[PDB]
Design a protein around this motif. Structure first.
Motif, PDB file in Angstrom:
ATOM      1  N   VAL A  24     -45.774  -2.599  18.623  1.00  0.00           N
ATOM      2  CA  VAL A  24     -46.319  -1.767  17.136  1.00  0.00           C
ATOM      3  C   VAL A  24     -45.818  -0.410  17.254  1.00  0.00           C
ATOM      4  O   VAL A  24     -46.037   0.417  17.979  1.00  0.00           O
ATOM      5  N   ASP A  29     -47.897   6.621   8.771  1.00  0.00           N
ATOM      6  CA  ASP A  29     -48.904   5.602   8.453  1.00  0.00           C
ATOM      7  C   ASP A  29     -48.265   4.186   8.119  1.00  0.00           C
ATOM      8  O   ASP A  29     -48.888   3.311   7.828  1.00  0.00           O
ATOM      9  N   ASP A  30     -46.737   4.281   7.910  1.00  0.00           N
ATOM     10  CA  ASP A  30     -46.405   2.919   7.718  1.00  0.00           C
ATOM     11  C   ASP A  30     -46.101   2.435   9.153  1.00  0.00           C
ATOM     12  O   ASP A  30     -45.910   2.983  10.047  1.00  0.00           O
ATOM     13  N   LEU A  31     -46.665   1.312   9.309  1.00  0.00           N
ATOM     14  CA  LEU A  31     -46.604   0.436  10.534  1.00  0.00           C
ATOM     15  C   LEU A  31     -45.600  -0.605  10.487  1.00  0.00           C
ATOM     16  O   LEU A  31     -45.347  -1.174   9.535  1.00  0.00           O
ATOM     17  N   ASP A  32     -45.114  -1.259  11.710  1.00  0.00           N
ATOM     18  CA  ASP A  32     -44.613  -2.443  11.750  1.00  0.00           C
ATOM     19  C   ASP A  32     -44.699  -3.049  13.063  1.00  0.00           C
ATOM     20  O   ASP A  32     -45.243  -2.572  14.123  1.00  0.00           O
ATOM     21  N   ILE A  33     -44.295  -4.250  13.320  1.00  0.00           N
ATOM     22  CA  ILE A  33     -44.415  -4.982  14.302  1.00  0.00           C
ATOM     23  C   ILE A  33     -43.355  -5.826  14.600  1.00  0.00           C
ATOM     24  O   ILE A  33     -43.376  -6.779  13.422  1.00  0.00           O
ATOM     25  N   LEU A  57     -34.597  -1.953  14.314  1.00  0.00           N
ATOM     26  CA  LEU A  57     -36.130  -2.494  14.462  1.00  0.00           C
ATOM     27  C   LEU A  57     -37.004  -1.002  15.149  1.00  0.00           C
ATOM     28  O   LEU A  57     -37.699  -0.737  14.746  1.00  0.00           O
ATOM     29  N   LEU A  67     -47.854   0.451  20.693  1.00  0.00           N
ATOM     30  CA  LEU A  67     -48.492  -0.274  21.403  1.00  0.00           C
ATOM     31  C   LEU A  67     -47.517  -1.503  21.960  1.00  0.00           C
ATOM     32  O   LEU A  67     -46.537  -1.680  21.129  1.00  0.00           O
TER      33      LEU A  67
ATOM     34  N   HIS B  26     -55.988   0.699  12.587  1.00  0.00           N
ATOM     35  CA  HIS B  26     -55.661   1.963  12.871  1.00  0.00           C
ATOM     36  C   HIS B  26     -56.770   3.110  12.325  1.00  0.00           C
ATOM     37  O   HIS B  26     -57.307   2.679  11.281  1.00  0.00           O
ATOM     38  N   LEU B  31     -54.092   3.229  17.272  1.00  0.00           N
ATOM     39  CA  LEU B  31     -54.004   1.828  16.568  1.00  0.00           C
ATOM     40  C   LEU B  31     -54.702   0.986  17.811  1.00  0.00           C
ATOM     41  O   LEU B  31     -54.624   1.198  18.995  1.00  0.00           O
ATOM     42  N   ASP B  65     -56.452  -0.147   5.308  1.00  0.00           N
ATOM     43  CA  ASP B  65     -54.978  -0.533   5.560  1.00  0.00           C
ATOM     44  C   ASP B  65     -54.790  -1.109   6.859  1.00  0.00           C
ATOM     45  O   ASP B  65     -54.777  -0.576   7.738  1.00  0.00           O
ATOM     46  N   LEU B  67     -51.977  -4.341   9.049  1.00  0.00           N
ATOM     47  CA  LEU B  67     -51.037  -5.267   8.932  1.00  0.00           C
ATOM     48  C   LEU B  67     -51.659  -6.646   9.656  1.00  0.00           C
ATOM     49  O   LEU B  67     -52.632  -6.761  10.539  1.00  0.00           O
ATOM     50  N   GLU B  69     -50.007 -10.209  11.386  1.00  0.00           N
ATOM     51  CA  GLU B  69     -48.631 -10.814  12.129  1.00  0.00           C
ATOM     52  C   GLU B  69     -49.055 -12.256  12.565  1.00  0.00           C
ATOM     53  O   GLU B  69     -50.176 -12.499  13.481  1.00  0.00           O
ATOM     54  N   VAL B  80     -45.027 -10.747   8.648  1.00  0.00           N
ATOM     55  CA  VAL B  80     -45.819  -9.448   8.784  1.00  0.00           C
ATOM     56  C   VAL B  80     -46.384  -9.330   7.329  1.00  0.00           C
ATOM     57  O   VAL B  80     -45.638  -9.230   6.320  1.00  0.00           O
ATOM     58  N   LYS B  82     -48.546  -6.861   4.852  1.00  0.00           N
ATOM     59  CA  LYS B  82     -49.203  -5.533   4.623  1.00  0.00           C
ATOM     60  C   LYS B  82     -50.263  -5.763   3.720  1.00  0.00           C
ATOM     61  O   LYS B  82     -50.018  -6.349   2.837  1.00  0.00           O
ATOM     62  N   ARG B 124     -39.086 -12.833   8.993  1.00  0.00           N
ATOM     63  CA  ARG B 124     -37.742 -12.604   9.646  1.00  0.00           C
ATOM     64  C   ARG B 124     -37.670 -13.803  10.602  1.00  0.00           C
ATOM     65  O   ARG B 124     -38.633 -14.186  11.274  1.00  0.00           O
TER      66      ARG B 124
END
Lengths: 127, 127
Positions: A24, A29-33, A57, A67, B26, B31, B65, B67, B69, B80, B82, B124
Motif C-alpha cells: 500500500v 492522501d491519494d492511496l494505491d495498492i 507502480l 504497508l 487511514h 494507514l 475516504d 480504498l 481491493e 481497486v 476508491k 489491472r
C-alpha cells in the motif's frame, strides 16, 4: 473475542508461507495498492521484504512509508507490515536479493528490487 | 506491456466473483488494511459495496475516504475501488443490505453494515 492478536513470530512465519503480498502506497492522501511476488529476508538486524518492480507502480515520488499485507480468509488471518520501501542500489545487495527465490520474470523485462525495512508487524486472526 | 488496464465492467464482474476484499483506511498518515466479506450492490445510480463490522477496525475517526481491493495472483489481476465508507443508518437500507447474501455471523455478535459509495474503479491484469 472475534479478533486474536497473533505473536510476531507466528505473524512472520505465516507471511513467509505466501509468495504474493500487497503493497500500500501513498502520495499524500491519494492511496494505491497492488499485489507483488515477494520474499521475506531475515539476514539483517530486522526483517526485510524484497520484491521487484518492472509500470510506474512504485515510483520515487510515492512516500517511502508503506504497508505490506498478506492474508487468507473464508475464519481467516492477515499480517500487516509497516515500513519504508527503497529501490536497492548496493551491487552486493541486488545480488543477495536474487538468491532468495523470487519467481523469474520474462528475461527481457529490466527491473529493480525494492527492499522494505520493517518497523512493525501486526498479525490478526478473525473467527 | 506487462500491465493491461481492464475495462470497468470487466473489473466489476471480477470483483463480484470474490466474497473477500480488503479495506484500506487511514487517519491522516497512519494507514491500516483488513480483509472483510463483502457484496457488490448495483441497485442505485452508482456501484456500492456492503460489508459488516462487529473490534474497532472501521471507526468514525477513520477518514470516510477508503480504498477497497480484490485480487488473484500467481500472472494475475486486481481491482481497486476508491470511495467513501459510511455505517448504514436507514432502517430500509440495512434490511436491503441483509438480502444480498453476505455470510451469516455467529447469531450473538451485534454488528453494523458499512456502505462504500464508489467514486472510481481500477482494474489491472499483470502478465
Amino acid at each position: 473475542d472475534p479478533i486474536t492478536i497473533l505473536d510476531s513470530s507466528d505473524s512472520l512465519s505465516r507471511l513467509s508461507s505466501e509468495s504474493v503480498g500487497r503493497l500500500v502506497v501513498h502520495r499524500k492522501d491519494d492511496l494505491d495498492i497492488f499485489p507483488v511476488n515477494f520474499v521475506l529476508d531475515y539476514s539483517a538486524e530486522q526483517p526485510r521484504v524484497y520484491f521487484r518492480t518492472a509500470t510506474k507502480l512504485f515510483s520515487v515520488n510515492l512516500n517511502s512509508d508503506v504497508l505490506f499485507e498478506v492474508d487468507r480468509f473464508d475464519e481467516g488471518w492477515s499480517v500487516v507490515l509497516k515500513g519504508n520501501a527503497y529501490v536497492v542500489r548496493d551491487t552486493e545487495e541486488a545480488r543477495h536479493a536474487d538468491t532468495l527465490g523470487l519467481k523469474p520474470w520474462l528475461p527481457t523485462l529490466k527491473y529493480n528490487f525494492v527492499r522494505i525495512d520493517v518497523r512493525e508487524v501486526s498479525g490478526r486472526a478473525f473467527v
